[PDB]
Amino acid sequence: NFSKAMSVAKQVFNSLTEYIQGPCTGNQQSLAHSRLWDAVVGFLHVFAHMMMKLAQDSSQIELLKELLDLQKDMVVMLLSLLEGNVVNGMIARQMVDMLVESSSNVEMILK
Structure with missing residues (x-):
């Protein structure tokens, strides 16, 4: 189900990282x-709620582990966009707006 879909999603981020x-x-x-920013926001929204739901069930832990490493592949792609970053950079500022819009989901992620 989602195991095969998340495997494809990792490669989409890895290619973007490369x-x-x-x-x-x-x-x-x-x-x-x-339109990557809105694509990240939707993925962040999915990451937020699904982590809460999957944590309850002990038999669905393997799905959470696959979900967790998918989120690690996203943050690397975000950390790669900050290479060559400058103060008040366009790419840096545009990422700030994306975090602000999805600030609700990030708080749960940190929690």
Whole structure:
């Protein structure tokens, strides 16, 4: 079910991670001017509620472990967009808006 879907989702993030690693100015600017931010917000929203639900069931722990490493693949992609970051950078500022919009889900993630 979600096990095969999350496996594909990791590779989508890993490919996105690979494009910007070894800082490429063009690719970072292209991804900044893209619908990736809303795609992250939806994934963050899914990450928030599903972690709470999956933690209750002891037989569904294996799904949570696969879910957890998927979130690790996302944050690496976000940490790669900050390569070559400058003060008040466009890519940095656009990420701040994305965190603000999904601030409700992040609080549960930290919790």
